[PDB]
Design a protein around this ligand. Structure first.
Ligand code: TSA
Ligand code: TSA
Ligand code: TYR
Ligand code: TYR
Lengths: 252, 252
């Protein structure tokens, strides 16, 4: 899957294959985060004791914005598969730009569930991957840099819905246009949903959490929890993206 | 440990013994619940398909509330070791009362972690003990009556912290008095924590699971998941109960 060969990107099989690769990445990251306590204070906005002057948001928010300018600089978000958490806040870098040929429809960057993803990650995901419960007072930074990678992976994967969506739209334009004009939510949804694929996903994840999750000579990840997570969050939201993208697919 | 002989209830060893008998009980209940699936729907609040007239709450909530009034009728909550889930929804019985002498301080009934207990049980425990993943449309009541059973045990056990707390308090009033006035959490926390004791507990659970969990002629419960639960939820929340009890211990 090459980003300057529109064809090799708008290929569903490929797209799924890439998603499969991400499974491990995401796993590895969860595994990492498991080492530290929950660290409530890190996600709590404007925490006294962790106040950063002229800045409003949570320790994590800060950490995430800083990092985003760093990645911003090495041209990260200039890429269609990369969508920033603090979008209206990054600057055009000091580096020639890779001129990625248009694959997705122009408004594509506007679709941005990071607000949701960040939220659900903090509230639903954290309790399931973190070990102890409480504030690990001198690992806030640690915890933070980790939450960020999880978050970025999570976002890449999830925001992949746009490609899938586009790819599918291609496969049957009349059918989709109809549904879209119709603003037929349930109709589109059931058409894009393929329970068989998502069925295999949940199965393999269980196996991976079992091998990677234990010292091969312990238990940094809970198989059932990972399923819970992908089932209740990862897969659901990817589909939200898919439909939202689809509706606006006939704009001017 | 006789509830009409206060001194025998305020003996730390006795309290510990009773907490041991409970291990089996809980295992049994867990073992029972393990026969049915996760059954998501039983937990979803006001589920379209299970809607109960003039009632906001989940199927479980209803099963739980009803059951509580039943036990309420047979004087269940009139005792210091039983703390209800819907505390103010309970009516006094039609039955001459047992007259328990004071053991705990008056505000005791107010210390109530059942919201957390119920919520954690639903999100962390259920996935670990239920066999498969999905809804068993004609076993919701079963799942529900057993969940409640697990719930009442956990609740009894966890809330035992109050007795422990009151005990440790008696053992060295001046020391705790200081910590309380200071409202020194970490100070109380590490002063009431006995890791040798909690270490021994995890040990025998591992074994108990290996024997009760398998048909002596399989695997209703992993000794690993059992250990996980007590370590992450049971013991932790029991300690929360002990701190708060102590903090409020100096009230007028
Ligand atoms: O077709 C697809 O592959 C994509 C991705 C998806 C997932 O979350 O993996 C898998 C199955 C489909 O129902 C949805 C969600 O569209
Ligand atoms: O001393 C105690 O007995 C009580 C109960 C407790 C537990 O949860 O088992 C066991 C050990 C202590 O560290 C805490 C938690 O207080
Ligand atoms: N793939 C692009 C965009 C990118 C940059 C940095 C990243 O961390 C991720 C993606 C590049 O490497 O130029
Ligand atoms: N032990 C008391 C209170 C009690 C009632 C019902 C129960 O389910 C449990 C405890 C009694 O039975 O007299």
């Amino acid at each position: 899957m090459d980003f300057t060969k529109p064809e090799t990107v708008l290929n569903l099989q490929n797209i799924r294959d890439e998603l499969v690769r991400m499974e491990d990445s995401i796993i590895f990251k969860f595994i990492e985060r498991s080492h530290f306590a929950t660290c409530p204070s890190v996600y709590e906005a404007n925490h006294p004791g962790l106040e950063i002057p002229n800045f409003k948001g949570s320790f994590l928010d800060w950490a995430l914005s800083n990092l985003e300018i760093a990645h911003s600089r090495i041209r990260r978000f200039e890429s269609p598969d990369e969508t920033p958490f603090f979008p209206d806040k990054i600057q055009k870098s000091f580096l020639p730009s890779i001129n990625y040929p248009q694959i997705l429809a122009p408004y594509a960057p506007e679709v941005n569930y990071n607000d949701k993803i960040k939220k659900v990650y903090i509230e639903k995901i954290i309790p399931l991957i973190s070990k102890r419960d409480g504030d690990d007072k001198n690992n806030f930074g640690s915890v933070a840099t980790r939450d960020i990678e999880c978050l970025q992976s999570l976002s890449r994967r999830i925001h992949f819905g746009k490609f899938v969506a586009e790819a599918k739209f291609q496969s049957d334009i009349p059918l989709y246009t109809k549904l879209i004009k119709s603003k037929d939510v349930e109709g589109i949804m059931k058409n894009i949903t393929n329970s068989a694929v998502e069925e295999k996903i949940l199965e393999r994840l269980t196996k991976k959490a079992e091998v990677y999750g234990v010292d091969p000579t312990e238990r940094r990840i809970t198989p059932e929890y990972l399923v819970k997570i992908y089932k209740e969050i990862v897969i659901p939201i990817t589909k939200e993206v898919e439909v939202e993208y689809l509706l606006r697919r006939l704009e001017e």
